Amino acid sequence: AVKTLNPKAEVARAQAALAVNISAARGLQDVLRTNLGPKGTMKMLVSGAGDIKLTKDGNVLLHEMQIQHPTASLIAKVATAQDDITGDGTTSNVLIIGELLKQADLYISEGLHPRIITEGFEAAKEKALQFLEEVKVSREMDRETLIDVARTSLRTKVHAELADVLTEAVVDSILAIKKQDEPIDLFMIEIMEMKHKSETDTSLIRGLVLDHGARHPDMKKRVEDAYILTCNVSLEYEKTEVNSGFFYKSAEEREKLVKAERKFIEDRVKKIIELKRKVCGDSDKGFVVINQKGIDPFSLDALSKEGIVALRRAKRR
Amino acid sequence: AAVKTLNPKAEVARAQAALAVNISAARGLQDVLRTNLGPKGTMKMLVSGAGDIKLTKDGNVLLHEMQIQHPTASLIAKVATAQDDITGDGTTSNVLIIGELLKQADLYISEGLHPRIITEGFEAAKEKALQFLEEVKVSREMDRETLIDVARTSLRTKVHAELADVLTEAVVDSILAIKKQDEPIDLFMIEIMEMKHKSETDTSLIRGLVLDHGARHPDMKKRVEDAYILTCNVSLEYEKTEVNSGFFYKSAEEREKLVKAERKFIEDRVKKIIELKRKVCGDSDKGFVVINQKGIDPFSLDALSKEGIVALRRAKRRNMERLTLACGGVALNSFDDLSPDCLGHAGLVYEYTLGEEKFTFIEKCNNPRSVTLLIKGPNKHTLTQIKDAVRDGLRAVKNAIDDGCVVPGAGAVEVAMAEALIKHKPSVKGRAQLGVQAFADALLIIPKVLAQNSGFDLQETLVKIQAEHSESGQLVGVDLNTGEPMVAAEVGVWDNYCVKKQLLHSCTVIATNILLVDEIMRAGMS
Amino acid sequence: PVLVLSQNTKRESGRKVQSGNINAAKTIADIIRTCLGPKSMMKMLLDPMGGIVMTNDGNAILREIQVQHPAAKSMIEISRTQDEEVGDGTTSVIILAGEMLSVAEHFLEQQMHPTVVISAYRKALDDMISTLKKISIPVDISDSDMMLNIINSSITTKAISRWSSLACNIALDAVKMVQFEENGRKEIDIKKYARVEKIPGGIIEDSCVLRGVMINKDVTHPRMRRYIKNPRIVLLDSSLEYKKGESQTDIEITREEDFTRILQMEEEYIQQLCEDIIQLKPDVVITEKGISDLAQHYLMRANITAIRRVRKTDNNRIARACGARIVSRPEELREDDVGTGAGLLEIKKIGDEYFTFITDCKDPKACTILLRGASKEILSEVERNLQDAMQVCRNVLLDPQLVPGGGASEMAVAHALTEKSKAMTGVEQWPYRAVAQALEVIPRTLIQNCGASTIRLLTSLRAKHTQENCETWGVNGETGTLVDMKELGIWEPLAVKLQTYKTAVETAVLLLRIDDIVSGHK
Amino acid sequence: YGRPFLIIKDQDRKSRLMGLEALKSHIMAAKAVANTMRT
Amino acid sequence: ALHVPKAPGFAQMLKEGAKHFSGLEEAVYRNIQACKELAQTTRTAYGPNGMNKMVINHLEKLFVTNDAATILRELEVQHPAAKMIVMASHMQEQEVGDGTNFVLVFAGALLELAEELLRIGLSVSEVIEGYEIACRKAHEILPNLVCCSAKNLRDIDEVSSLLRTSIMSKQYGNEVFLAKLIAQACVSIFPDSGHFNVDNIRVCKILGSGISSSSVLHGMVFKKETEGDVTSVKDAKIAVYSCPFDGMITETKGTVLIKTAEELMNFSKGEENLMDAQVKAIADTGANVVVTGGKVADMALHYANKYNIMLVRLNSKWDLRRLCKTVGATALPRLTPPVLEEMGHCDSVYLSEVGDTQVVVFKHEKEDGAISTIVLRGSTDNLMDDIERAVDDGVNTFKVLTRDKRLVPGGGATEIELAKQITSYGETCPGLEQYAIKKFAEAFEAIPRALAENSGVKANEVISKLYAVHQEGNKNVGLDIEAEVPAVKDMLEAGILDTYLGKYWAIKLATNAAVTVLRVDQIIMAKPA
Ligand SMILES: Nc1ncnc2c1ncn2[C@@H]1O[C@H](COP(=O)(O)OP(=O)(O)O)[C@@H](O)[C@H]1O
Ligand SMILES: Nc1ncnc2c1ncn2[C@@H]1O[C@H](COP(=O)(O)OP(=O)(O)O)[C@@H](O)[C@H]1O
Ligand SMILES: Nc1ncnc2c1ncn2[C@@H]1O[C@H](COP(=O)(O)OP(=O)(O)O)[C@@H](O)[C@H]1O
Ligand SMILES: Nc1ncnc2c1ncn2[C@@H]1O[C@H](COP(=O)(O)OP(=O)(O)O)[C@@H](O)[C@H]1O
Ligand SMILES: [Mg+2]
Ligand SMILES: [Mg+2]
Ligand SMILES: [Mg+2]
Ligand SMILES: [Mg+2]
């Protein structure tokens, strides 16, 4: 009874609240149930700009549905949390919510209170947890079982041949893990995109693919036996922090001052050149420098004249 | 899209959409209407655009006066109004049964099932239920007590206790005074007169008639003891010549002669009446009453008043028949021949003035074949509520009289019929048998609400009821005061066989028609 | 601002409009595709005036649809044509017309001039009519069981199929009762002499066709008898009160004995009219116009039941049922105009109204169906199905030919004219066989409606139909299975099938002939 | 053809004088200027 | 009963502008219809008789051309399925350089036939799997259809003949001339190492005379004018600089300090003397042309004129690097007169006028160089644009000819032969999927018919003749152009061929697009903003 206090207020009372929640859950379940399993049907989604998104995920579709209902948003963030922590099982989540709500309303409309329904739900959840604990099979996770699990997931997501090639790639990717007791870090297995040849050409590269290239035209485009120098120093012109300024009296002084200002980065690059020449300049053994921060074209040319390849502005990861 | 491409401003609802919207509307109507069924229901108060108040519990009144515009709502509304216009009761149960059939059909369809087999199960269940109802009714003799019981079961549902008792006594007494050896039961013979007057329990039955007219002439007598009655359809008003008359004189004396000649015709017409009265009986204050459907001139009014005659003008068309069957006279369209056999008798004719209006009571007849029910109320909405209750009770009693049978009440028949349907379910072949199951469960909507409105839990009361019937085939229904199973015949809760048959027919037919719908359309606007 | 044409004129021309035309037709074929066959689904329409129409038949579906595309208007017109001519096959003709237009679209796109397509369509129509007449099975008119089977076949696809064994009979009786002959002319005039009247509230199987006429009137006076054994019905066209006339009169009164004299003359004229109508000793008098109070007084004096204003159609039906004759001047009423033959007159009460029955006639040539149900829409639907059954029975009566249903005739004529096509050499063969495969839509629609895999089922139907003496092999839509219509006992009148094919091909031709559209002018 | 085609931007408001009428207008304006300067 | 309410559930919780299409007839059929419309809006621009089409973009710029990718890109498309087909055609253009109109026609035909099959009663999955099986079969049998693989890729006449058939699809009249110029330009850049680049063939657009006045030069042409006063150096040594022709300054702000009158005297004289010394140091190395990537100082310009140094300014990094490639020099960030190994050598540099367009020319006279430029003339900007599109298509044909030199017959021969083989395979295959296979034979009929559709002949007649002849087995016969009657002729002898890789990728991408658009059965559009 807030319409007395707030005239522009929206209120849904007990039976009204139950009815609206069950109806919203039924709508979400009916939309989401047409894709569960490998036999589901794709969904094409268009945003305001006009970009096309073909999806079958529960979470992706649920986010890109044009809905405004409150309980719909509740189950949407439940589903996205479940996706974030576990990885999948989002469409089945929504279907299960819809079915619990439908059965509960079926047993409540007969003149019943939801409290006993929820008590029964809690007891059933305890029994279900016991049964699930006692039904699981524990084995040694090997190549074949991982192929089976990944094949199930990818066969759910995509069609047969692409699912199988992706399953092989995914298992071979997440099988190069560290010590058994050390938990897996999934940041290392990074995804790179290429609008390129057919969809069956996606694969696993043992090393890395970087979206940046050699910025100097004269650097070699392929090195066979490569040393790698990963860095985080800036070969870019770093000006004095405290508002400095040059003062001279003639053009000769100007030239001397420009040489002096370049000297610092010249020395820093000369350190790299000395390291390369001391390690190996022989038998066409190449040297690669991968830097997170920028590199100035003066230093690009200085490194290029030594037969080096240098990569600037790489990601932190 | 189809239609929306041809008609841009059009509405289309497809198969799943049509089912969803139909079941949603049916559930809404059922949820609104389920709170008035049974004597323990709650009255609804309705206000129109003008602002007049109407209290009601009828399914038909509530369903017509509810502010809705849904299509299926209108469909079930006119189903209910037809069921009311034929039987006169069982309209709330109509929409409740519709809602439950549609809910169960949606329950069994949402599992991915085609409605056709559900409707086939509905047809099989309807047939079996019809046989069970035909073999469960009790055929007795419609004595006074049985009619009082039926009228009480209806009116106590409609109104509270004391008013229901008074109205049942009045209704039974009236209906026993119209019936003949044949079976016409002309309910038109029952006047239902209203009076914003003393308390609502003062309504009663008058053997004669009550007319909303009176003696217009001031000097006419207001009470005659033993009255001859002359019902007429002649016009004592002045009537001009049809064929374009017109007078032509030349002097004032000529004008006076012309006015005398103009009056002469109607003066002779009234002279016939006065000679009839004097010839029949002028003495001992034996009154004479002339009741005319058409008008009476002031000249003729005064002439009749000068002769101790009370005259009423502008009476209803049906009042001619009602008076000639009550007072025993004969309706007259002309005065060619007047004889003493053309006069009815009345043992007391008097006039009561209420506020500004006047009423004439004609009672103390020797043997009335047409009586009247006088309703007295402190306000208009009470009068309308009593009128609706009286209509429903009279229709229930008439339906009891028409066929010598009556069904046990209190939801017992639905419980027994559902149990029989469950027992018969194995016999019908195919998956459509589950549809029969739905029908059975659908019937349980009737007894359940009887408990629901009484405050008891649905599940416990229903299982208690069905265990008693399964153990012993005795027809037990809901006891609205305790919730325990009580035999309907022993307690006297009776219901009309025609009403139950009409429910089982119309509900199934309209539910079947609705379930088959796969497209709701709105096109036809230019 | 110089304009050769008006500002509101819009011109559209070229392939586009042709495509659009086809599209429009297909759209209407897309609305009623699911209402065909014994497993049809009900369709509910919201009337613009506030009513509801719940039907399955195509014409009652397209009558409440407002369309702005002219090709859609032509489709609605062919629907109305099929309803008016033979009364059945509306969805069938709409579906065929739409799908023949669709299959002609392919040849339209392949730079083929529409005139050759029209000529091929005409040739195909002639051949299909010929081979449909070839496979006809004659019917016996006198066989009541065979006519019951035919009407049941025509009605099993609609709402009242549940009460078919009842409703069927009703229709037959009516069609066998309005049947009439006079001056060597046969009528079977269902429209004017077989009235169907719906009273809401009751039971479906309580409905019945009467051996007479029922109308919604009541006795003018309470004392008139409401129960007559052998009435002598007399019908009146004029009125029984005093009327002014035509010429202006303006009577002038000077004497003191002219006003009352005028009124007494009016009464005397009414009395003379009543005595002259009584002179033939009738028993019930029916008039279209009013009855004055004095007139019904005089009628009561002779024990005559009078009924006030009655519509002209009801009076014509009463005259036909009783054998009476409507008259205007009671001065000119003879004995042969008095209706002997009515066996009962009942003033019964239904609900809160009074209904009069003139039932149990000697040999009435006009009937009336007391059609009792649950609601106005349900009775309206039952009314439509009853009209369908009457039209089918009339078609059988006027034409003793039959043809298998369920899709057997379509595939039969398709195979026959395909075999005919495989011999002729020329460029017109392709549209011809396109029409041949076009008729395949009815079995396909039936299979899609019953819920069966249409591809292999229809292929098996065609393969089984290639074998000789199998032209009666159709699809059972109750279960969706290849059956023989001879054992299933479904046959439709040849009139309906040939009319459907004719008008479908004709309207396909009409919509295929047009390539320009000019819109907007007065 | 029925369709009126548009070639010049904003051509519904532009005005054009051609032939001898334009020369008459020129001569008339020049005469007005000369008459103003004559006095 | 005068308003149908929204169905409870999803339809009642949708947003305002959101449109939800679900079911086969409400989504799949609409997608098929839209894709058919997109295919037919361009079908008329297919083949050597395709009419050019004019498109006004959203910025009111005229594009007259028959290149399917260009008219498809510069024409706003709002339907999702049509956007899918647009993406597929553009990917085909990027991968090969031809087949975009082929992709449009094939995708439209596949979707129309899929709609027909779905109407008949096949399932979505059945049609999709049949399409995939048929596509794999076509890819398996395609290599057996090749003939007349490219042999040399160095002889002028042979490469001109090979490119002429890829040129005739645009400007059907002037075919041999454009092919000759494209071949001459392309051969001079083939670096005899196998890595032939397409960005080393530049086009210079000069208004003026007709097409027959176009030419190719083994250098570059810039629409610029020299900043100095010396023009037409005979055999110059070019120095290329990435810094402005000015005394370089500190990146940090620097203000000069003068505390005595002597410094104020000597500042300008010293700066001038330093600049003169720098210019003299650059000039004494034999340099005649100096090109800079930035502004040129007035004093530097003076000292350039004094020592007779041509000075050409450039205002694009791409132009600078391309000039470095074509002359053999490298840009250096300071003045520092270049050492002997980084002095560009060019046979001449000119400032010339041809069409009232003063241009700077770096022409070589020994056919040597890594960059050659087409200077193509014309009378209108749009016509030269169409010619440039044709040159790009020919260059891309040469590029895709460097690898996978195999060729397949054109003029409808390959499509019809492939359709015949695939329908034989379908008829020799059981199961419910075979129907889809039998549709590819019809889909490959869309291509030759379109050709006939644009030649003013009967498509059915030429298709019947094509099957009638191909039944014998002469797999190298196709549609004849300009015979005034539907006829067929050989394509191996006529030189009408197409790259095997191009047709391979076109078929693959068209099938991929059709299958992907068929797969989806539910669309949720969201409030077009
Ligand atoms: N090949 C298969 N055969 C039968 N069932 C499968 C197969 N693959 C997956 N499933 C089942 O189908 C379901 C697919 O769920 P999924 O769509 O992945 O849910 P979510 O989208 O919420 O992650 C899983 O529960 C799995 O058990
Ligand atoms: N005193 C009572 N005890 C138990 N049941 C009753 C009693 N009075 C009525 N009932 C039952 O309650 C139901 C009331 O129905 P009612 O409200 O009259 O339906 P409608 O309003 O449609 O006429 C009846 O079916 C009757 O059998
Ligand atoms: N039991 C049945 N099984 C299969 N087909 C049937 C059956 N009954 C009727 N039909 C076919 O259905 C058609 C009639 O369907 P109907 O709904 O009346 O369409 P229309 O209104 O166009 O006549 C007839 O052509 C008949 O052959
Ligand atoms: N002289 C010719 N005779 C017959 N056909 C030709 C001739 N020249 C080209 N063609 C055909 O015309 C087609 C032109 O297609 P094109 O417009 O290049 O497609 P896209 O724009 O997708 O590259 C080619 O498939 C080729 O086989
Ligand atoms: Mg998954
Ligand atoms: Mg009641
Ligand atoms: Mg029919
Ligand atoms: Mg091309």
- Token pair 């454009």: residue: E178
E416-419: long-range contacts at Cβ-Cβ below 8 A with a sequence spacing of 24 or more?
E416/E444, E416/E445, E416/E448, E416/E463, E416/E466, E416/E467, E416/E470, E416/E478, E417/E145, E417/E470, E417/E475, E418/E138, E418/E141, E418/E142, E418/E145, E418/E444, E419/E443, E419/E444, E419/E445
Q: Which two tokens stand for residue B161?
A: 């206790």
- Residue B85 appears among annotated catalytic residues: no
| 3 state DSSP class of B211 | strand
Cα B271 off chain centre by:
44
β-strands B11-13, B517-522 pairing: antiparallel
Number of domains composing chain E: 3
How far is it, in rounded angstroms, from Cα B245 to Cα B261?
A: 14
Tell me the CA distances in angstroms from E31 to C188, E371, E443, E507, one per residue in order: 53, 46, 18, 20
**Residue set of the binding site of A for ADP:** 37, 89-92, 156-157
Q: Which two tokens stand for residue E326?
A: 């074509």
Q: Quickly list DSSP for C251-275.
A: --B-STTSHHHHHHHHHHHHHHHHH
Beta carbons within 10 angstroms of residue B244's beta carbon? 13
Q: Which residues contact C518 (CB under 8 A, 6 or more apart)?
A: C9, C10, C11, C12
| Gap from CA of B375 to ligand 5 centroid (Å) | 74
Tell me the CA distances in angstroms from B34 to A13, B59, B446, B450, C27, one per residue in order: 19, 9, 9, 9, 43
CB C389 within 8 A of CB C147: no
* Closest of E370, E404, E394 to residue E190, by C-alpha: E370
| Closest CB from B1, B12, B74 relative to E1 | B74
- Token pair 């010293």: residue: E270
Q: Is B40 annotated as a binding residue?
A: no
Chains that touch D (3 or more CB pairs under 8 A): C
CB E139 within 8 A of CB E63: no
How many helices (H) does chain E have, and how many strands (E)?
15, 19
* Closest of B328, B357, B332 to residue B345, by C-alpha: B328
How far is it, in rounded angstroms, from Cα A148 to Cα A154?
A: 10
Q: What is the CA radius of gyration of chain D?
A: 17
Starting at the earlier edge strand, list the strands of the sheet with A43-46: A52-55, A43-46, E522-525, E19-22
Q: Which residues contact A303 (CB under 8 A, 6 or more apart)?
A: A216, A269, A272, A273, A289, A295, A310
CB B51 within 8 A of CB B461: no
Q: How many CB pairs under 8 A join C and D?
A: 6
Containing domain of residue C230, as a range?
Answer: 213-370
Q: In the 3-class helix/strand/coil scheme, how is B476-500 assigned residue by residue?
A: EEECCCCCCEEEHHHHCCEECHHHH
Residue B410 Cβ < 6 Å to ligand 2: yes
Q: Which residues contact A69 (CB under 8 A, 6 or more apart)?
A: A24, A27, E13
Same domain, E33 and E145: yes
Tell me the CA distances in angstroms from E495 to E176, E455, E487, E489, E490, one per residue in order: 12, 19, 17, 12, 9
* Closest of E138, E136, E117 to residue E432, by C-alpha: E117
Please count the CA atoms within 13 angstroms of the CA of E444 that sit on its side-chain side. Answer: 28
Residue ranges of the alpha helices (H) in E142-174? 156-167
- Angle, vertex CA B53, rays to CA B50 and CA B56, nearest 5: 135
- E15 is a domain residue: no
- Residue B58 appears among annotated catalytic residues: yes
* Closest of C389, C405, C386 to residue C397, by C-alpha: C389
How far is it, in rounded angstroms, from Cα E309 to Cα A286?
A: 41
Q: Which residues contact B343 (CB under 8 A, 6 or more apart)?
A: B228, B229, B230, B280, B329
How far is it, in rounded angstroms, from Cα B492 to Cα B490?
A: 6
**Chain-chain contact of B107 with A106 (C-beta, under 8 angstroms):** yes
**Residue set of the binding site of E for ATP:** 99-101, 169-170, 411, 498, 503
Tell me the CA distances in angstroms from A191 to A175, A211, A212, C485, one per residue in order: 16, 12, 15, 65
Residue ranges of the alpha helices (H) in C44-89? 58-62, 70-85
| Gap from CA of C56 to ligand 7 centroid (Å) | 10
**Assigned CATH for A140-206:** 3.30.260.10
Q: Measured between CA atoms, how close is C2 to chain D, in angstroms?
A: 9
In total, chain C counts a number of residues equal to: 522
Experimental technique for the deposited model: cryo-EM
- Domain map (residue ranges) of chain B: 12-140+405-521, 141-207+369-404, 208-368
How far is it, in rounded angstroms, from Cα B270 to Cα B293?
A: 15
Q: What is the CA radius of gyration of chain B?
A: 30
* β-pair partners for E313: E292
**Assigned CATH for B12-140+405-521:** 1.10.560.10
Q: Which residues contact C225 (CB under 8 A, 6 or more apart)?
A: C219, C303, C305
| 3 state DSSP class of C10 | strand
Exactly one of C127, C173, C283, C388 is catalytic; which is it? Answer: C388
- At A47, the amino acid letter reads S
Burial of C463 (0-12, 13-18, 19+ CB in 10 A): exposed
How far is it, in rounded angstroms, from Cα B313 to Cα B297?
A: 9
Q: Which residues contact A58 (CB under 8 A, 6 or more apart)?
A: A32, A35, A79, A83, A90, A91, A92, A93, A94
How far is it, in rounded angstroms, from Cα E403 to Cα E400?
A: 6
Burial of B526 (0-12, 13-18, 19+ CB in 10 A): exposed
- E127 is a domain residue: yes
CB B228 within 8 A of CB B343: yes
CB E433 within 8 A of CB E130: yes
* Closest of B468, B472, B465 to residue B410, by C-alpha: B465
How far is it, in rounded angstroms, from Cα A194 to Cα E168?
A: 33
Evaluate whether chains D and E are touching (3 or more beta carbon pairs less than 8 Å apart). no
Which H helix or E strand runs over C45?
A: strand C42-46
Q: Which ligand is nearest to the CA of C479?
A: 3
Which H helix or E strand runs over B363?
A: strand B357-363
| Protein residues whose CB sits closer than 6 Å to any atom of ligand 1 | A 36-38, 58, 88-93, 152, 155-156
How far is it, in rounded angstroms, from Cα B38 to Cα B436?
A: 26
Q: Is B482 annotated as a binding residue?
A: no
Q: Which two tokens stand for residue E159?
A: 């490469």
* β-pair partners for B376: B195
CB E404 within 8 A of CB E236: no
| 3 state DSSP class of C361 | strand
Same domain, E231 and E352: yes
- Residue B482 appears among annotated catalytic residues: no
- Residue B91 appears among annotated catalytic residues: yes
For C357, phi then psi, to 5°, come to -115, 140
DSSP A67: B
Residue ranges of the alpha helices (H) in B372-496? 380-402, 412-424, 433-443, 445-454, 458-471, 488-491
How far is it, in rounded angstroms, from Cα C416 to Cα C411?
A: 8
How far is it, in rounded angstroms, from Cα C284 to Cα C341?
A: 13
Q: Which residues contact E115 (CB under 8 A, 6 or more apart)?
A: E28, E29, E32
Chains that touch A (3 or more CB pairs under 8 A): B, E
How far is it, in rounded angstroms, from Cα C89 to Cα C410?
A: 13
- Token pair 């279900």: residue: A128
DSSP B408: E
Q: Which two tokens stand for residue A25?
A: 């859950």
- Token pair 């017992």: residue: B412
Tell me the CA distances in angstroms from E104 to A248, B498, E97, E417, one per residue in order: 68, 71, 14, 20
Same domain, E40 and E121: yes
Beta carbons within 10 angstroms of residue A193's beta carbon? 8
- E483 is a domain residue: yes
* Closest of B1, B276, A227, B214 to residue E29, by C-alpha: B1
How far is it, in rounded angstroms, from Cα B189 to Cα B171?
A: 13
Q: How many CB pairs under 8 A join B and C?
A: 196
- E10 is a domain residue: no
CA dihedral of A36, A37, A41, A44, whole degrees rounded to 10: 60
CB B170 within 8 A of CB B177: no
| Gap from CA of A258 to ligand 7 centroid (Å) | 100
Containing domain of residue E457, as a range?
Answer: 28-149+406-525
Q: Which two tokens stand for residue C3?
A: 């304009």
| Ligand 3 atom closest to Cα of residue C488 | 1
Q: Measured between CA atoms, how close is A133 to chain E, in angstroms?
A: 36
Which residues in chain B have Cβ-Cβ distances shorter than 8 Å to E5?
Answer: 21, 70
How far is it, in rounded angstroms, from Cα E196 to Cα C505?
A: 64
Same domain, E391 and E419: no
- At E12, the amino acid letter reads Q
The domain spanning residue E209 has which CATH number?
Answer: 3.30.260.10
Same domain, E160 and E272: no
Same domain, E241 and E347: yes
- At E282, the amino acid letter reads I
Angle separating helix axes B252-281 and B298-305, nearest 10 degrees: 40
- At B202, the amino acid letter reads D
Tell me the CA distances in angstroms from E449 to B181, C111, E179, E442, one per residue in order: 92, 11, 27, 11
Exactly one of B35, B56, B58, B106 is catalytic; which is it? Answer: B58
CB B363 within 8 A of CB B348: yes
In total, chain A counts a number of residues equal to: 317
How far is it, in rounded angstroms, from Cα C429 to Cα C427?
A: 6
Beta carbons within 10 angstroms of residue C193's beta carbon? 24
Same domain, E281 and E252: yes
Name the CATH code of domain B141-207+369-404 (choices 3.30.260.10, 3.40.47.10, 3.90.1170.50, 3.40.50.261).
3.30.260.10
Same domain, E181 and E247: no
Q: What is the CA radius of gyration of chain C?
A: 30
How far is it, in rounded angstroms, from Cα B331 to Cα B344?
A: 10
Same domain, E202 and E307: no
The domain spanning residue C231 has which CATH number?
Answer: 3.50.7.10
Beta carbons within 10 angstroms of residue B80's beta carbon? 28
For E401, phi then psi, to 5°, come to -85, -25
* β-pair partners for B406: B138
Same domain, E95 and E127: yes
Cα E357 off chain centre by:
26
- At B457, the amino acid letter reads D
